[PDB]
Design a protein around this motif. Structure first.
Motif, mmCIF file in Angstrom:
data_model
loop_
_atom_site.group_PDB
_atom_site.id
_atom_site.type_symbol
_atom_site.label_atom_id
_atom_site.label_comp_id
_atom_site.label_asym_id
_atom_site.label_seq_id
_atom_site.Cartn_x
_atom_site.Cartn_y
_atom_site.Cartn_z
ATOM 1 N N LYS B 57 0.849 -1.193 0.000
ATOM 2 C CA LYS B 57 0.000 0.000 0.000
ATOM 3 C C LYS B 57 0.884 1.241 0.000
ATOM 4 C CE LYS B 57 -3.607 2.582 2.372
ATOM 5 N NZ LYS B 57 -4.448 2.817 1.157
ATOM 6 N N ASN B 58 0.553 2.183 -0.883
ATOM 7 C CA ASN B 58 1.331 3.404 -1.120
ATOM 8 C C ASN B 58 2.614 3.200 -1.926
ATOM 9 O OD1 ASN B 58 -0.417 5.535 -0.141
ATOM 10 N ND2 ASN B 58 -0.014 4.767 1.936
ATOM 11 N N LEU B 59 2.820 1.971 -2.405
ATOM 12 C CA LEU B 59 3.862 1.678 -3.392
ATOM 13 C C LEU B 59 3.238 1.280 -4.726
ATOM 14 C CD1 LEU B 59 6.290 -0.437 -1.148
ATOM 15 C CD2 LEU B 59 6.294 2.045 -1.469
ATOM 16 N N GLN B 96 7.627 4.413 -4.184
ATOM 17 C CA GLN B 96 6.788 5.393 -3.507
ATOM 18 C C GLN B 96 6.996 6.746 -4.187
ATOM 19 O OE1 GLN B 96 7.826 5.964 0.599
ATOM 20 N NE2 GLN B 96 5.999 7.189 1.047
ATOM 21 N N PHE B 97 5.913 7.484 -4.412
ATOM 22 C CA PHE B 97 6.035 8.817 -5.009
ATOM 23 C C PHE B 97 5.895 9.858 -3.917
ATOM 24 C CE2 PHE B 97 4.305 6.115 -8.465
ATOM 25 C CZ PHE B 97 5.431 6.121 -9.271
ATOM 26 N N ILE B 98 7.023 10.446 -3.536
ATOM 27 C CA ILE B 98 7.055 11.327 -2.379
ATOM 28 C C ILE B 98 7.101 12.780 -2.832
ATOM 29 C CG2 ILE B 98 8.172 11.874 -0.193
ATOM 30 C CD1 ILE B 98 9.509 9.095 -0.335
ATOM 31 N N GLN B 99 6.055 13.528 -2.498
ATOM 32 C CA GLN B 99 5.980 14.945 -2.839
ATOM 33 C C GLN B 99 7.174 15.712 -2.276
ATOM 34 O OE1 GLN B 99 2.843 17.297 -0.992
ATOM 35 N NE2 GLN B 99 2.255 18.065 -3.025
ATOM 36 N N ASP B 100 7.686 16.676 -3.043
ATOM 37 C CA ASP B 100 8.775 17.515 -2.558
ATOM 38 C C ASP B 100 8.241 18.437 -1.474
ATOM 39 O OD1 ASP B 100 11.616 18.539 -2.878
ATOM 40 O OD2 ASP B 100 10.492 20.403 -3.180
ATOM 41 N N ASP B 101 9.048 18.668 -0.443
ATOM 42 C CA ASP B 101 8.625 19.502 0.679
ATOM 43 C C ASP B 101 8.580 20.990 0.347
ATOM 44 O OD1 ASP B 101 7.970 17.596 2.728
ATOM 45 O OD2 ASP B 101 10.126 17.214 2.965
ATOM 46 N N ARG B 108 9.653 12.746 -5.740
ATOM 47 C CA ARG B 108 10.751 11.823 -5.913
ATOM 48 C C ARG B 108 10.211 10.438 -6.175
ATOM 49 N NH1 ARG B 108 12.492 15.886 -2.808
ATOM 50 N NH2 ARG B 108 14.471 16.765 -3.576
ATOM 51 N N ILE B 109 10.958 9.686 -6.977
ATOM 52 C CA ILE B 109 10.631 8.303 -7.267
ATOM 53 C C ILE B 109 11.501 7.445 -6.354
ATOM 54 C CG2 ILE B 109 10.472 6.506 -9.024
ATOM 55 C CD1 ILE B 109 10.300 8.877 -11.108
ATOM 56 N N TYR B 110 10.902 7.035 -5.243
ATOM 57 C CA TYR B 110 11.621 6.411 -4.138
ATOM 58 C C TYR B 110 11.414 4.899 -4.110
ATOM 59 C CZ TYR B 110 13.003 5.222 0.617
ATOM 60 O OH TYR B 110 13.597 4.654 1.715
ATOM 61 N N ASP B 111 12.485 4.166 -3.820
ATOM 62 C CA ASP B 111 12.422 2.711 -3.735
ATOM 63 C C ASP B 111 12.655 2.275 -2.292
ATOM 64 O OD1 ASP B 111 12.630 0.284 -5.974
ATOM 65 O OD2 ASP B 111 13.648 -0.192 -4.087
ATOM 66 N N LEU B 112 11.653 1.630 -1.696
ATOM 67 C CA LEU B 112 11.740 1.207 -0.297
ATOM 68 C C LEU B 112 12.787 0.111 -0.094
ATOM 69 C CD1 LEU B 112 10.487 1.498 2.656
ATOM 70 C CD2 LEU B 112 8.994 -0.399 2.003
ATOM 71 N N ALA B 113 12.883 -0.813 -1.050
ATOM 72 C CA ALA B 113 13.821 -1.928 -0.924
ATOM 73 C C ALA B 113 15.268 -1.454 -0.884
ATOM 74 C CB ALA B 113 13.618 -2.940 -2.042
ATOM 75 N N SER B 114 15.600 -0.462 -1.712
ATOM 76 C CA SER B 114 16.980 0.026 -1.831
ATOM 77 C C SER B 114 17.257 1.382 -1.166
ATOM 78 C CB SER B 114 17.382 0.107 -3.307
ATOM 79 O OG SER B 114 16.556 1.026 -4.002
ATOM 80 N N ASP B 115 16.220 2.018 -0.618
ATOM 81 C CA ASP B 115 16.350 3.343 0.003
ATOM 82 C C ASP B 115 16.995 4.357 -0.959
ATOM 83 O OD1 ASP B 115 16.109 5.326 1.952
ATOM 84 O OD2 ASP B 115 18.029 4.859 2.877
#
Ligand SMILES: CC(=O)N[C@@H]1[C@@H](O[C@@H]2O[C@H](CO)[C@H](O)[C@H](O)[C@H]2O)[C@@H](O)[C@@H](CO)O[C@@H]1O
Ligand SMILES: CC(=O)N[C@@H]1[C@@H](O[C@@H]2O[C@H](CO)[C@H](O)[C@H](O)[C@H]2O)[C@@H](O)[C@@H](CO)O[C@@H]1O
Ligand SMILES: CC(=O)N[C@@H]1[C@@H](O[C@@H]2O[C@H](CO)[C@H](O)[C@H](O)[C@H]2O)[C@@H](O)[C@@H](CO)O[C@@H]1O
Ligand SMILES: CC(=O)N[C@@H]1[C@@H](O[C@@H]2O[C@H](CO)[C@H](O)[C@H](O)[C@H]2O)[C@@H](O)[C@@H](CO)O[C@@H]1O
Lengths: 146, 146
Positions: B57-59, B96-101, B108-115
């Protein structure tokens, strides 16, 4: 970036907020069951981590020492932050520890399921809880080894 | 905070970098299979999302329209950013698609497995790839609906 100094699996610690100096507790009776606390050291303030594997790699369950419940952080229903039996049965039992961008020694306690971080403040009620939004210093925590 | 405007499942888009204006392509021959490109619109620049559920969820898996392969982002072997058949069989296929602050219109196009996060730059080789570290502008992306 994941916090680079996460306690080894099974090691005991307190979670202390960097700014307020308050700690998280987790108990089975007398609401709030999970909240912040400013006072003497008690066992319900002690936690250990279960390390996530497979799809939960880089996530962790936060288990209470005296009662064995794991933390949850959700936006679906009150209480938003609480505890539940098991070893992380539910997706909202799984946390990421994300290092702060400015202070390498503190982290946010982030929940992937609910897109929230935990916070501790001395201002508005609720003084402890979770939050989806901008980065504030009241979201910064330390692992306190015991 | 998760990007608030993620394309609906199955909706086609390009991934364009905010600053370079380059797009990601994903092809099946000729290394690099996944890279950045500056030029006319071509089909191997088209993607859809597979929505994660339960522990995901959220990925999201990022799936090529023409070739059906999904992206991966890893740190264990080369290539670090690449593609693989399936619908997100592997943990490092999940983003995960993380909005810029600062800029709410990019993520950002973020990968949980690889950080890691994906980046696009015109500066040092490698000009496209993944990265674990500070937030920089060349890590910011747009969904470009077609
Ligand atoms: C004395 C008292 O009522 N204190 C409140 C807190 O309760 C204490 O919490 C600690 C936590 O480690 C421990 O469980 C004690 O047994 C308990 O009495 C707590 O409820 C907070 C909630 O904000 O309020 C007082 O500090
Ligand atoms: C099925 C049900 O109604 N159970 C309630 C619990 O809800 C579950 O709580 C977990 C916590 O990790 C998670 O949020 C699930 O989505 C949710 O269904 C829980 O709310 C408890 C007390 O908090 O009450 C019921 O058992
Ligand atoms: C705008 C507002 O009051 N929102 C509430 C939250 O408050 C924010 O909390 C963060 C925590 O890092 C920080 O203290 C901000 O300054 C503050 O505005 C918070 O209280 C939550 C708790 O569920 O409710 C609202 O979202
Ligand atoms: C020294 C170096 O190559 N660092 C790279 C980062 O570069 C930063 O880029 C931003 C703009 O995005 C800004 O110009 C900074 O001054 C600069 O240091 C950046 O490319 C990241 C990838 O996101 O990694 C590189 O190592």
């Amino acid at each position: 970036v994941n916090f680079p100094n996460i306690p080894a699996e099974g090691v005991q610690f307190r979670l202390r907020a960097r700014d307020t100096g308050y700690v998280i507790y987790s108990r089975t009776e007398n609401p709030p069951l999970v909240w912040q606390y400013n006072g003497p050291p008690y066992d319900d303030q002690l936690f250990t981590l279960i390390y996530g594997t497979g799809p939960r790699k880089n996530l962790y369950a936060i288990k209470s020492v005296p009662n064995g419940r794991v933390l949850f952080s959700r936006t679906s229903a009150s209480p938003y932050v609480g505890n539940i039996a098991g070893d992380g049965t539910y997706n909202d039992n799984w946390f990421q520890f994300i290092q702060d961008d400015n202070d390498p020694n503190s982290f946010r306690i982030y929940d992937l399921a609910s897109d929230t971080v935990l916070y501790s403040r001395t201002t508005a009620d609720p003084k402890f809880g979770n939050f989806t939004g901008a980065k504030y210093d009241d979201q910064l925590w330390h692992f306190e080894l015991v």
